Ligand binder design. Sequence first.
Ligand SMILES: *[C@@H]1O[C@H](CO)[C@@H](O[C@@H]2O[C@H](CO)[C@@H](O)[C@H](O)[C@H]2NC(C)=O)[C@H](O)[C@H]1NC(C)=O
Ligand SMILES: *[C@@H]1O[C@H](CO)[C@@H](O[C@@H]2O[C@H](CO)[C@@H](O)[C@H](O)[C@H]2NC(C)=O)[C@H](O)[C@H]1NC(C)=O
Lengths: 215, 216, 115, 114
Amino acid sequence: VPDSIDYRKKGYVTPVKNQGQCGSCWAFSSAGALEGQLKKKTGKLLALSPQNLVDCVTENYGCGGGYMTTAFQYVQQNGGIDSEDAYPYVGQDESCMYNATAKAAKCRGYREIPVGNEKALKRAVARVGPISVSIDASLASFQFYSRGVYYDENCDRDNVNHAVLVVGYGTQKGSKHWIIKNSWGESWGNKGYALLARNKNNACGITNMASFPKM
Amino acid sequence: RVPDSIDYRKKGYVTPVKNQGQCGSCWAFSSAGALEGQLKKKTGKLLALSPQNLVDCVTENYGCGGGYMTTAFQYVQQNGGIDSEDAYPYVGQDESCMYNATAKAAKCRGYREIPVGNEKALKRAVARVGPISVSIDASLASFQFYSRGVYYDENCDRDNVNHAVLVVGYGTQKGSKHWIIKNSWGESWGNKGYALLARNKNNACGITNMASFPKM
Amino acid sequence: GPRMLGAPEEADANEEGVRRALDFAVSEYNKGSNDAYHSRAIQVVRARKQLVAGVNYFLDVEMGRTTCTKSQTNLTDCPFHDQPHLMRKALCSFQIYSVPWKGTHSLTKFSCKNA
Amino acid sequence: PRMLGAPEEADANEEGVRRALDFAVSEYNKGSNDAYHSRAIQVVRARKQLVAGVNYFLDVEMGRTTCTKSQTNLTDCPFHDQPHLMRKALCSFQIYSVPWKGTHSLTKFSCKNA
Ligand SMILES: *[C@@H]1O[C@H](CO)[C@@H](O[C@@H]2O[C@H](CO)[C@@H](O)[C@H](O)[C@H]2NC(C)=O)[C@H](O)[C@H]1NC(C)=O
Ligand SMILES: *[C@@H]1O[C@H](CO)[C@@H](O[C@@H]2O[C@H](CO)[C@@H](O)[C@H](O)[C@H]2NC(C)=O)[C@H](O)[C@H]1NC(C)=O
């Protein structure tokens, strides 16, 4: 468990995308976690289809929201998930179009991060890879984020509301941080990425609902 | 509580038969074949991997002058991957390691070996894992001129194997249990490149004498 | 229990984002009305918000015709019309997509009826 | 254990090796430009390798014989007398055999003097 680590440098993270007007953050977060485990087990970085998950994860509500745990259950029970290329993202609800012959990744289950334990998340991020996490992204200070390590006293560390992807952790100008990838386009934040406060008492509830898939 | 018959060709786990030619690279076709099947299982895509990668680069083997499968599996683990047949096409001749880093097509996290002489074990391994690299006695003429049926020969040396093939299933044919094996001797050998070897008949041809598969 | 991520939720109509989505709806409403008089909001019957790449606002609002004209300058006081044939009512559904860091508002679904 | 596809020493009396030696003799005469038939005295080292078929690595001592290059009584053809008329040679062959195709193929060969 090193003190610095950035899975973008290692070639584990696909380019930042934009979920648009669709409540599909859970699909992007879970897809990026699968993209990470596909890289670790295969060596190929292949963008996967969040649209696949939005349309076909019947226990979630598509653009009406969902959980990352259910997305992994889908890929497990369904026996695969298509690539972004074979099943591109459209930012809207539609009928399931899962193409089994074009599947690009499977999933043997998921393991949840213990609630509240940032050491455990750090441990998981170090041995596993990019981890899907839930945060409270509702504050304006998070919408207008630009630089530095984000910390805001008013961040609801009990009720989280948005999925992102932890692609590493480190330190910047003295403060420890998480490295999170968002799905709000490169025009948000820092080219689509942000730094969230680490070990500042579960800032924004980042460990309240974190998960990763097993391949 | 394990299936009576399985055929990984139907499941989309097996690439088409190849011909190793004059090069003695059966071990590389077998290992690459077990890795092909195990990549299909983990990810879902079937991609033919490069036996020439292994012939050239497994320096602890002798390239076209022979080798082991477990060694090939250990190379891809420590080397950190193996290229695909398209990126590293087969030539059937020794050459320098042209392994291409960024063209990683599959990875390997070790290997495991079948208990020697335990066909019951090999049966479970084929069912659970997938296609298993195995070693047989393929030196007899009866095997060279095999064409159909369940191969059995009382002279098949079940103590000293000499050739690597790839088990891709098992079952029964006319009431004789058998193993399904993919050879590396082209489609004009055997039954479009495959054969049925006698199963549960006292380790016929030493099939479980040196069987292994990779971990991903 | 713990809500779902990205799901719509009820919104307080006094937020600095709901008010701004409302003033946007009114502005596009007046531009989409053949009515001479400028129209303004009476009440918000329902306000829902949804977190996405930005925010979706789902506003069910009661609109009303005022006495002041569509193109007055000091459009800061505009009382509702008194006489029965001076006044008019409507219940409107707006879906507004806001991107705060781009400073944009967008009307994506719209539907008014009498009320 | 033993490596798979590794060449190994072989007995020159084996059916496969005798068949490979005859092919080497025929190809040896086919491209010699000689007067008399020239067969093998003995095999001094034989190795076989298992592949898509069988590779044979043969070291043989050759020598010119009494019989002419084109006569059909090739069954009983002894060797010439003096070293001047014998032209002894130690040949090293390399034969790719594919039994289920009926194929024999001479990949490599050379001959020093003995
Ligand atoms: C599911 O995806 C596969 C893979 O992309 C599609 O297979 C294509 O089939 C056509 C002929 O039907 C070929 O010309 C293409 O080359 C195939 N694709 C590839 C990538 O090789 C298949 O058509 C898709 N099925 C659907 C969408 O129903
Ligand atoms: C080894 O792999 C590298 C991959 O980096 C190959 O370089 C690529 O070549 C293709 C063919 O035009 C390009 O489309 C890629 O853009 C190249 N890579 C990068 C990073 O740009 C290289 O050709 C391979 N070597 C071989 C096959 O001998």
